Nucleic acid binder design. Structure first.
Lengths: 1041, 110
RNA sequence: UUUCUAUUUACGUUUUAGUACUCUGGAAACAGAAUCUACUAAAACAAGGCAAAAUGCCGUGUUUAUCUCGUCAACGUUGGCGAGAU
């Protein structure tokens, strides 16, 4: 119904937790968490790389087919002719002279066509695992091909080295074209050829689709012409719809980023701390046009002030000050320095766009040539070889100019410019839409994990709005981890840091001889960081007195928590009780200025600066907090502290906040949405003592969310921070007041006691997900009549691979060699026995004899042996593709048929199920339909009668209820044995085992074949309500897809 | 301290699977979480455990699907098995060719 | 903040065919046998679905409770629409 409530979100990487809090009574209407499999860039890299292959294979087959059709036209190739025996390499060399028979000629042309070779030498996109780069390989081949054509080099390699294929046969298309025309000029004198045929064949040989032409007609991933190419590569700007987004390395956008940094810088001087228009122009010109990489010292020298007074700039990971440089402008000045080029913003922009979109240098030089500029021909050739310009989607140029104008005139930053101008996304009209539209999340450039999390969170918001009405306030937390590969790296690093601190504590314990260190960890961490020096009075502090008299020292906060909002060790220090009492709720600047301190401010600053550099014991923010000369009473300074410590600033959170604010503003809904920093929720978890454990399952992602919502209620019951809310949703107090405001654990036990934490998982009905694992294992037939898969041993000569050894000693009869070729087994065995001590006897044999294990021969002319094949295991499930490979004496199979869904039937009182495998979902146009014949065959294979009643059909993650215990299906394990796989709904089983320290295997596998009293289907909405689902009486055949 | 990164390419060298962790055991645990449990050959962890304890694989009906006699496997699990030694999770990854045909492990010490 | 696409090369897993290998009959021409180990050509490379001599085109990613009402669309079931319920 209509109930005022605060909504809180915990937007993780693999979950989105939601919580509802009563506006009045701190109550909890409903909590929960939506789940989803972690999005990964890899999968999409999968579909794309494969698509890229299918296309290469299709183009190769089409070129072969077109050449074959062309040669039918001239009667050179006919169906009766046999091309089986002709050798391609020997025919190309002969035909470079003499004459070729009609067959040999056909073989040779078809042969060059199958392999044209690369065209743009650097165009290749591949790793250097082959140990020879593509460009170096072509360079060596060209150095070898001065007087010899391609065929000659390949034939010479086959006769001398014995091989042609491999990584040595990477060539360039020009040599192939030269060979083709050279052979054709000779062979046209004997056969009926015309210049039209010659041109057609050469075209077919060197033809290729440029990166700006795309696929042909009718493709969903294509474009009609090059204007549409710009539109697709750039996209329409969300801020101004009709204008297209510009490139990022372009000069105007470089100026915008650089001006952001310049505006952010704070310089302690008699003038304003923020630089004004004229000196901003002076600094930008001098620094960013005379020096390639700007540094802070250069700025300090040009404004002739102390570098010590400059604060508030981005820093690299290594601590070096970072300033974004006009890379394109300096790159221009490197080659040419004329005035006519460097002071033309439009020319520099167009140059940048061309370099960024046009990968090939030949296209770049042509496009600058078509641009009627002052560039000269000699300069264009040099400029065309510029690199590193690789950013495609960036704020539109028309908006960039508007932001740059405001930046030049005023000292503001981008966020407040956006708020002032009230720039609103216009790609989708927010007025007409009934609910928040998930389309807008596509445009902001966010990693796929964050995109999926945002879409799920928006759907959760839509569901909650539809259920409990309009939310008075929404609080959104995006979690710190970008992706899982970072959650582990961070957890590992934190574990290592925890271990080093534990080691310091243990070393102290032995020397001290007391257990006081057990509760003194916070102070002892501070002591060595301050090197036993009271930062407020410089007096030396012995480490022993800290343990003996812990009350003589206290953990004071550098900045009052009423404004700093920071509770990290960076904002903590060990000080004399008298020092802390005298300091009060103020800043160290005015206190060291005051006579209370027994040291002067300048000496304090000198000690702090030298200490910060030495031993890396003072963090970057710690010295800024210590040396914060600006008065905290100023509204701008309190706002700055709130933003750096309480308001998230990462692009992702901002974009989501801006989208939600725009949606609520357009529809005129009085909904305040606000963000919370990642460390703030950790602190509020610590001070309310809710951190008992992190393995209670997924309910953790819910509980944190609840706390997030509670933050709102503690930002409106107290007027002292109320203004701060107005800052964060768009007096000065001591630390005990801060503790009174936040520590108070009243009505927070509700989070401890709430047990009805609804959970939900994302069903994955998508068809065509994957079909068969790809490794076309061959098979053989053994004596007992079975069929065995023949896995192949590879990399035998490598130092660490000992498989051959283990197999030889344990089971020789498994190597195919044992029976089909015995002598060679004898040679391998004699080698294994003599050098058996080494992990890899073959490597040790190579290290002393320098010969690979050759096949046994009477003349010792045998070939090398690099792959030995062996019988492996028996065959149970297989997609037999033997029909594709013609006349195959032995079967060819693929394994691991990935199941799509399974349907449960109740026949004669017993429950069975038929597995609709993904291979049985054929695709016709838009609809995806279950192959009726294969489905019927599978149904009959399970011994299912025709009157069997239909109960349900389960996809992935649909909730099942077997004998009364709810579970979520992951997929059927083995269909023949009637085994399905379920992981518990609340906590992943792997965790359920650790909270009991059991060692049972990690995947619950349950059996539906018999003794299964009930198999019902339960389903859960995005929020998480559990509603038993009564399904239809015929299994679904057509999914719209 | 050591970081081991598993780069596994599918047979065509086209689709690439990559996981990383502190001890090889961590590599297997991440690869079965991030890229699913059937990317490696079916039932490889069990097959290696049975082989290390010393049981005859044929009795349990080893198949491409792997242990097919679940009843007996459960009995072996009941007996105190001898656990894997974190030097054989490498073997678990290099004896699977169903999808990850080419497996190359890089070990960084720092 | 770094996603989404685009073109291309070499490889690579597999079968068949050929040339080497191994073996037997055997003076062997060769006949075979074995299909093991190397090359070499051609073919297939997620099941398949369109299209129709085209510098041809889709198929492993995003979006997903279920049931329902009606509305509309594809085509009876799916949509999509909306409005509910569970």
């Amino acid at each position: 119904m209509k109930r005022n409530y605060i909504l809180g979100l915990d937007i993780g990487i693999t979950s989105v937790g939601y919580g509802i809090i009563d506006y009045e009574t701190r109550d909890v209407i409903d909590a929960g968490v939506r789940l989803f499999k972690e999005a990964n860039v890899e999968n999409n890299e999968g579909r794309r790389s494969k698509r890229g292959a299918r296309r290469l294979k299709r183009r190769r087959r089409h070129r072969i087919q077109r050449v074959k059709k062309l040669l039918f036209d001239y009667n050179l190739l006919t169906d009766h002719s046999e091309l089986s025996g002709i050798n391609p390499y020997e025919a190309r060399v002969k035909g470079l002279s003499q004459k070729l028979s009609e067959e040999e000629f056909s073989a040779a042309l078809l042969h060059l066509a199958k392999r044209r070779g690369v065209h743009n030498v650097n165009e290749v996109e591949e790793d250097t695992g082959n140990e020879l780069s593509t460009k170096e390989q072509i360079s060596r081949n060209s150095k070898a091909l001065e007087e010899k054509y391609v065929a000659e080099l390949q034939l010479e390699r086959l006769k001398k080295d014995g091989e042609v294929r491999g990584s040595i046969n990477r060539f360039k298309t020009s040599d192939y074209v030269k060979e083709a025309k050279q052979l054709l000029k000779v062979q046209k004198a004997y056969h009926q050829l015309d210049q039209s045929f010659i041109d057609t064949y050469i075209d077919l040989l060197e033809t290729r689709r440029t990166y700006y032409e795309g696929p042909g007609e009718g493709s969903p991933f294509g474009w009609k012409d090059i204007k549409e190419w710009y539109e697709m590569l750039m996209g329409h700007c969300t801020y101004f719809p009709e204008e297209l987004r510009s490139v990022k390395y372009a000069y105007n956008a470089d100026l915008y980023n650089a001006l952001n940094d310049l505006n952010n810088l704070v310089i302690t001087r008699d003038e304003n701390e923020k630089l004004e228009y004229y000196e901003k122009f002076q600094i930008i010109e001098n620094v960013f046009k005379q020096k390639k990489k700007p540094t802070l010292k250069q700025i300090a020298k040009e404004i002739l002030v102390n570098e010590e007074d400059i604060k508030g700039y981005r820093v690299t990971s290594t601590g070096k000050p970072e300033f974004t440089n006009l890379k394109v402008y300096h790159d221009i000045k490197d080659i040419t320095a004329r005035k006519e080029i460097i002071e033309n913003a439009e020319l520099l922009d167009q140059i940048a766009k061309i370099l960024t979109i046009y990968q090939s240098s030949e296209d770049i030089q042509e496009e600058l040539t078509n641009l009627n500029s002052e560039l000269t021909q000699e300069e264009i050739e040099q400029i065309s070889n510029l690199k590193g310009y690789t950013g495609t989607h960036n704020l539109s140029l028309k908006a960039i100019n508007l932001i740059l104008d405001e930046l030049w005139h005023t000292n503001d930053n981008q966020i407040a410019i956006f708020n002032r101008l009230k720039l609103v996304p216009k790609k989708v009209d927010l007025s007409q839409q009934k609910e928040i539209p998930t389309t807008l999340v596509d445009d902001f450039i966010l990693s796929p994990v964050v995109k999926r999390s945002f879409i799920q969170s928006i759907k959760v918001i839509n569901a909650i709005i539809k259920k409990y009405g309009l939310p008075n306030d929404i609080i959104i937390e995006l979690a710190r981890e970008k992706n899982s590969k970072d959650a582990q790296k961070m957890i590992n690093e934190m574990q290592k840091r925890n271990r080093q601190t534990n080691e310091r504590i243990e070393e102290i314990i032995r020397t001290t001889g007391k257990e006081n260190a057990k509760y003194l960890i916070e102070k002892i961490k501070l002591h060595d960081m301050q090197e036993g020096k009271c930062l407020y009075s410089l007096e030396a502090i012995p480490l022993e007195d800290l343990l003996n008299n812990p009350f003589n020292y206290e953990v004071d906060h550098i900045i009052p928590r009423s404004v700093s909002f920071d509770n990290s060790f960076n904002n903590k220090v060990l000080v004399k009780q008298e020092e802390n009492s005298k300091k009060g709720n103020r800043t160290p600047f005015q206190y060291l200025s005051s006579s209370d301190s027994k040291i002067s401010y300048e000496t304090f600053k000198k000690h702090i600066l030298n200490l910060a550099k030495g031993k890396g014991r003072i963090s970057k923010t710690k010295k800024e907090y210590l040396l914060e000369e600006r008065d905290i009473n100023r509204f701008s300074v309190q706002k700055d502290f709130i933003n750096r410590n309480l308001v998230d600033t990462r692009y992702a959170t901002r974009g989501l906040m801006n989208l939600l604010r725009s949606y609520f503003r357009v529809n005129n809904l009085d909904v305040k949405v606000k963000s919370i920093n990642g460390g703030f929720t950790s602190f509020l978890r610590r001070k309310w003592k809710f951190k008992k454990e992190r393995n209670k399952g997924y309910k953790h992602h819910a509980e944190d969310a609840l706390i997030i919502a509670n933050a709102d209620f503690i930002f409106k019951e107290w007027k002292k921070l109320d203004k701060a809310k107005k800052v964060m949703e768009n007096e000065i107090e001591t630390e005990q007041e801060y503790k009174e405001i936040f520590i108070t654990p009243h009505q927070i036990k509700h989070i401890k006691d709430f047990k009805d934490y609804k959970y939900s998982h994302r069903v994955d009905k998508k068809p065509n997900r994957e079909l068969i694992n790809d490794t076309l294992y061959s098979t053989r037939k053994d004596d007992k009549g079975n069929t065995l898969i023949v896995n192949n041993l590879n990399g035998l000569y490598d130092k660490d691979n000992d498989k051959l050894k283990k197999l030889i000693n344990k089971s020789p009869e498994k190597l195919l060699m044992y029976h089909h070729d015995p002598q060679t087994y004898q040679k391998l065995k004699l080698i294994m026995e003599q050098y058996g001590d080494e992990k890899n006897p073959l490597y040790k044999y190579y290290e002393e004899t320098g010969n690979y294990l050759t096949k046994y021969s009477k003349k010792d002319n045998g070939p090398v042996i690099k792959k030995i094949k062996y019988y492996g295991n028996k065959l149970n499930a297989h997609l037999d593709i033997t029909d594709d490979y013609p006349n195959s004496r032995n079967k060819v199979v693929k394994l691991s048929l990935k199941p799509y869904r399974f349907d449960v039937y109740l026949d004669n009182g017993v429950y069975k199920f038929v597995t609709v495998k993904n291979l049985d979902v054929i695709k016709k146009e838009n609809y995806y339909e279950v192959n009726s014949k294969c489905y019927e065959e599978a149904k009959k294979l399970k011994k299912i009668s025709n009157q069997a009643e239909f109960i349900a059909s389960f996809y992935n993650n649909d909730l099942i209820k077997i004998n009364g215990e709810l579970y979520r299906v992951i997929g059927v394990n083995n269909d023949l044995l009637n085994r399905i796989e379920v992981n518990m709904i609340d906590i992943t089983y792997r965790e359920y085992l650790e909270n009991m320290n059991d060692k049972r295997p990690p995947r619950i596998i349950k059996t539906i074949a018999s003794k299964t009293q009930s198999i019902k289907k339960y389903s859960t909405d995005i929020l998480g309500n559990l509603y038993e689902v009564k399904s239809k009486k015929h299994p679904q055949i057509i999914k719209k897809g | 301290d050591t970081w081991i990164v598993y780069r596994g390419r599918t047979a065509d060298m086209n689709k690439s699977y990559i996981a990383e962790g502190s001890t090889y055991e961590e590599v297997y645990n991440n690869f079965v979480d991030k890229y699913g449990y059937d990317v490696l050959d079916e039932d490889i962890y069990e097959i290696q455990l049975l082989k290390k304890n010393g049981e005859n694989l044929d009795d349990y009906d080893v198949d491409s699907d792997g242990i097919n006699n679940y009843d007996k496997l459960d009995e072996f699990r009941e007996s105190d098995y001898v656990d894997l030694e974190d030097y054989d999770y490498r073997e678990l990854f290099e004896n699977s060719s169903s999808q990850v045909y080419y497996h190359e492990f890089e070990i960084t010490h720092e």
